[PDB]
């Protein structure tokens, strides 16, 4: 038995599940963060896109069945019979990034025609075939990534198995930048707390940058927001004192605290703030199968049920890799707004000079596009 | 038969409610302790107990004697201190003070005396401990305007 191909939803039904999709995209991001931190070292930078990741998992969930269809729904925090998630995910696409999602298969893996078109319509990409020898398949994948990523992600894979049958790929870089340009002449070497010492990293500086911020008690952290282009914004969470390690801030982030902070930032006004932070330039390649097992999802290496995609009984995911190339420097859009005159005898300040956690947020559809941390700006 | 009478008792801290004289056999008496005393019936200090003139001629519950009420070691207060007295019994008086230049109490607290109920009490504050709130507006180091 196999549940047939899913049914197309109407534009109002899919626009009705936008609130449903934006909520599971928050629960799923937190599960990816705890998995990524359990895989990298104790004090390492990492950057992953929880959106593009779920965009490829739901592309898989389109052709799943039996236990694989339900585990993918519980991993992605989806409700049952969520038939309008495929169209709702395509609509959440933002022009501030450039991401790719392809599925490579060996010649001996027959793809059902019910999926060749269902993948080319709901995600604009049909499964691509691989060559015969494994030597060409390695360079065939990296060049296809180096072509459809504007030469940003060059080496998505370092190796391919000889018995490669099923490959899942996703590389995304950030083409969006700040809505307000930073002055490069004010880029001063400011101190930065690392481990227990004081390292000097290149830091940007702006006396009246628009930053909407406050204090949250549940995290004991300063929560600030910065406005990007393409209706995007970068949220930055810095512990208040140095008494609280970033690890303690990580263990305190719940799905309730997350949603209680983003809804407080959508209603907090951007105010002329004095700001200082280092350049953000984090790239993270990670074997995503190691992440699936870190979320107790043992379907890609055992008992894989993908009847809607193929009718092959012996099928397992041969590889699965992700790479996020996020970079933000002194480049912006609206150079400046000026218009300062505050007569109040107070000071407004937000300063990121210690290990922190960043989330690139999509204010329109309300969902985390990127998510990561920075332990060393160097 | 001759109902042997029970003689009275030197009761300095107690009073016999039936009292009278020539207590006969099968005559119960209420030995009640005075204010500031209690009979510890082996456990909780009650204000009185009972004794029956038995057939021998002595009083039952002779092992019970009204003893002075103990208030116990006084509990300390926040930003405060109390000197340990020689005795914590009834009538003993203690004294609470605050810190020197950063606390001054309220006033007022004219020392506390162990009462008959078993609690430390002050003339007006009663069973309420004094509180040490900060002495306001005290610059620790005078500020010299360098000019």
């Amino acid at each position: 038995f196999c549940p047939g191909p899913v049914t197309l939803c109407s534009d109002l039904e899919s626009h009705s599940t936008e609130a449903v999709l934006g909520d599971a995209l928050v629960d799923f991001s937190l599960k990816l963060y705890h998995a990524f931190s359990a895989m990298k070292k104790v004090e390492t930078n990492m950057a992953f896109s929880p959106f593009s990741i779920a965009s490829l998992l739901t592309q898989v969930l389109l052709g799943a069945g039996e236990n694989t269809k339900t585990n993918l729904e519980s991993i992605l925090s989806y409700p049952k019979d969520f038939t309008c998630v495929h169209q709702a995910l395509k609509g959440f696409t933002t022009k501030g990034v450039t991401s790719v999602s392809q599925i490579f298969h060996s010649p001996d893996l027959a793809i059902r025609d019910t999926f060749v078109n269902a993948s080319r319509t709901l995600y604009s990409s049909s499964p691509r075939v691989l060559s015969n020898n494994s030597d060409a398949n390695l360079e065939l994948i990296n060049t296809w990534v180096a072509k459809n990523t504007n030469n940003k992600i060059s080496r998505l894979l370092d190796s391919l198995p000889s018995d490669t049958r099923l490959v899942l790929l996703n590389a995304i870089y950030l083409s969006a930048k700040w809505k307000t340009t930073f002055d490069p002449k004010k880029t001063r070497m400011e101190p930065f707390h690392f481990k227990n010492s004081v390292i000097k990293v290149p830091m940007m500086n702006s006396k009246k940058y628009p930053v909407a911020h406050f204090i949250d008690q549940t995290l004991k952290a300063k929560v600030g927001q910065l406005q990007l282009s393409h209706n995007l914004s970068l949220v930055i969470l810095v512990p208040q004192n140095l008494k609280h390690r970033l690890e303690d801030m990580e263990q305190a982030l719940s799905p309730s605290v997350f949603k209680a902070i983003m809804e407080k930032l959508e209603m907090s006004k951007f105010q002329p703030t004095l700001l200082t932070l280092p350049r953000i330039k984090v790239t993270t390649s990670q074997d995503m199968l190691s992440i699936m097992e870190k979320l107790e999802f043992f379907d890609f290496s055992y008992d894989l049920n993908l009847c809607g995609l193929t009718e092959d009984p012996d099928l397992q995911v041969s590889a699965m890799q992700h790479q996020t190339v996020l970079e933000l420097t002194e480049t912006g859009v609206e150079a400046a707004a000026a218009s300062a005159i505050s007569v109040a005898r107070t000071l407004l300040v937000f300063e990121v000079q210690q290990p922190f956690l960043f989330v690139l947020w999509d204010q329109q559809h309300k969902f985390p596009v990127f998510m990561g941390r920075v332990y060393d700006p160097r | 038969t001759g109902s042997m009478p029970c003689p009275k008792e030197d009761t300095p801290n107690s009073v016999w409610e039936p009292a009278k004289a020539k207590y006969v056999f099968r005559d119960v008496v209420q030995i009640t302790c005075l204010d500031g005393f209690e009979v510890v019936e082996g456990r909780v200090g009650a204000t009185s107990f009972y004794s029956t003139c038995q057939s021998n001629g002595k009083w039952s519950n002779s092992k019970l004697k009204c003893q002075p009420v103990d208030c116990g070691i006084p509990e300390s207060i926040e930003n405060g201190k109390v000197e340990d007295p020689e005795s914590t019994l009834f009538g003993s008086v203690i004294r609470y003070t605050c810190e020197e230049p950063y606390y001054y109490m309220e006033n007022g607290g004219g020392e506390y005396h162990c009462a008959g109920n078993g609690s430390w009490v002050n003339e007006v504050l009663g069973p309420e401990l004094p509180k040490c709130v900060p002495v306001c507006g005290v610059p620790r180091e005078p500020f010299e305007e360098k000019q």
Binding site: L348 | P139, Q147
Partner: protein, 248 residues
């Protein structure tokens, strides 16, 4: 604190420091902190510190942090008004209730409050002290505490030529009797980062203590003159607030 000298935290043990609204505060008792309304305006949970000469990042982690319980603003304040206080800063005062009491010592002890009598009525010739980590002449940020002596100036010298068109020039800053003017002498004044600081004035009856006569509120071009919230007019509201929100 422009035109001022250095001062250890012992000179101002009541001086509270605020993080998000990089501003000042004033301790009044073991449970309540006094500051400006705009200080705890957009931040209903401030980050407070006491008992520290320096506010170096290396120092705030080793200084006593106060945990606030609730923020009480004076009802005569603005609301969702976009940061620019173009309308007014009348009734620029607020009370912060602390969850934990404050252990007082050589570097933390509260300041007294202005009495209800007529001697505490501020006037010309009176002198005052301002303390804060605001902007001096060198940097915009003062790591170690600065302080300067300011006299009570007439309010006529406050109303100065300062651009007052944040949005609609039609809006004009109004001066209320709930504000005190000071400065002028040697150019000493309070600038950005001093809001909530107590305008420490010696008590006329007990000449050994001090009381907060004003809180650093607003003003024109800093270094000239400005406006401190007259605390004597809000003594009835501070007492009616500390007693209602009792500590049960």
């Amino acid at each position: 604190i422009i035109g001022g000298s250095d001062a250890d935290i012992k000179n101002f043990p009541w001086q509270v420091f605020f993080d998000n609204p990089w501003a000042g505060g004033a301790l009044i008792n073991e449970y309540w902190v006094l500051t400006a309304a705009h200080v705890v305006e957009g931040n209903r949970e401030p980050t407070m510190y006491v008992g520290s000469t320096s506010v170096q990042t290396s120092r705030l982690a080793k200084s006593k942090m106060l945990t606030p319980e609730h923020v009480f603003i004076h009802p005569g304040w603005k609301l969702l008004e976009v940061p620019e206080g173009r309308t007014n800063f009348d009734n620029d005062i607020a009370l912060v209730r602390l969850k934990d009491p404050v252990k007082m010592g050589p570097t933390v002890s509260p300041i007294c409050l202005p009495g209800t009598s007529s001697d505490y009525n501020l006037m010309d010739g009176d002198l005052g002290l301002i303390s804060g980590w605001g902007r001096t002449e060198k940097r915009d940020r003062a790591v170690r505490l600065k302080a300067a002596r300011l006299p009570v100036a007439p309010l006529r010298k406050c109303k100065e030529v300062k651009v007052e068109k944040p949005t609609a020039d039609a809006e004009a800053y109004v001066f209320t009797p709930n504000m005190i003017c000071a400065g002028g002498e040697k150019g000493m004044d309070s600038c950005k980062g001093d809001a909530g600081g107590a305008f420490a004035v010696q008590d006329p009856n007990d000449k050994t203590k001090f009381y907060a006569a004003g809180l650093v509120s607003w003003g024109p071009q800093c270094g000239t003159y400005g406006l401190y919230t007259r605390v004597k007019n809000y003594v009835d509201w501070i007492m009616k607030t500390m007693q209602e929100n009792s500590t049960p």
